[PDB]
């Protein structure tokens, strides 16, 4: 998971 | 927004709608060319390519549930575009380039005909 | 293989498939969730759960055009994890995560469990 | 394009  | 983004997520998708594919779930058309068949979702095929697209958003071809491509249309070329629309994988051979290309300019699949016109002019 | 691989591709696909979803382009069916209805493709929601899997490759459920959540699931996570199922983006919330935690879990979606435990047990 |  990530900051998109 | 402030969303968390699963970095894998469409290609899990796209591996998905491929094991569908391979087990033949809920396919929902047959594609003819020439001699040969191959089945699939008509959702992956409009995303793919914009023959398809403008097919399936026909009124009256979006509830066939067979479509015959030109004559011209190798089936070799076909499949190899078809396993590219399912995986992200082009199976470019000097070989089968110019069939695929010539097929990719049909469907309108402009990312595949760009790689094709590329890997043709390097040769010449 | 000696296969070339378009990174965009299966990014560029769901891209396309949740347009279609928008436009409400052969979406096949559609989700009650108690008094809301959230309309999908089925092989998209199968490709993102475990329990739409399950109940579209069921010989009788694969032909319904109308499938009930149990009552306990809330619209807002349904609606959060469907957005989620078409974009891979989670809009993850303290108003809403143990909402989102529970709609995962029924529908099987191992992944947004995964993180919703990680985010709650940073809380604690 | 890239060598997978
Ligand atoms: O080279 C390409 C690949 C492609 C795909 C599609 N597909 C869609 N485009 C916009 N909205 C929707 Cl809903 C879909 Cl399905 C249309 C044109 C093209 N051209
Ligand atoms: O957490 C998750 C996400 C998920 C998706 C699916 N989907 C599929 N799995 C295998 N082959 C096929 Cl054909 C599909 Cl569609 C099954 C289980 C789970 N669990
Ligand atoms: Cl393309
Ligand atoms: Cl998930």
Redesign the pocket.
């Known amino acids: 998971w990530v900051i998109p | 927004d402030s969303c968390i983004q699963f970095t894998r997520h469409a290609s899990?998708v796209l591996?998905?709608?491929?094991?569908?594919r391979?087990?033949d779930?809920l396919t929902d058309v047959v594609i003819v060319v020439s001699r040969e068949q191959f089945r699939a979702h008509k959702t992956v095929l409009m995303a793919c390519s914009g023959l398809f697209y403008s097919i399936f958003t026909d009124q009256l071809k979006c509830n066939l549930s067979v479509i015959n491509l030109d004559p011209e249309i190798n089936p070799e070329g076909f499949c190899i575009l078809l396993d590219f629309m399912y995986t992200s994988r082009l199976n470019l051979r000097e070989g089968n380039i110019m069939a695929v290309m010539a097929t990719a300019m049909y469907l309108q699949m402009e990312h595949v005909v760009d790689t094709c016109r590329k890997f043709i002019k390097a040769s010449e």
Request: aromatic residues 0%; glycine residues 0%.
């Open positions: 899990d591996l998905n709608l491929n094991r569908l391979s087990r779930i």
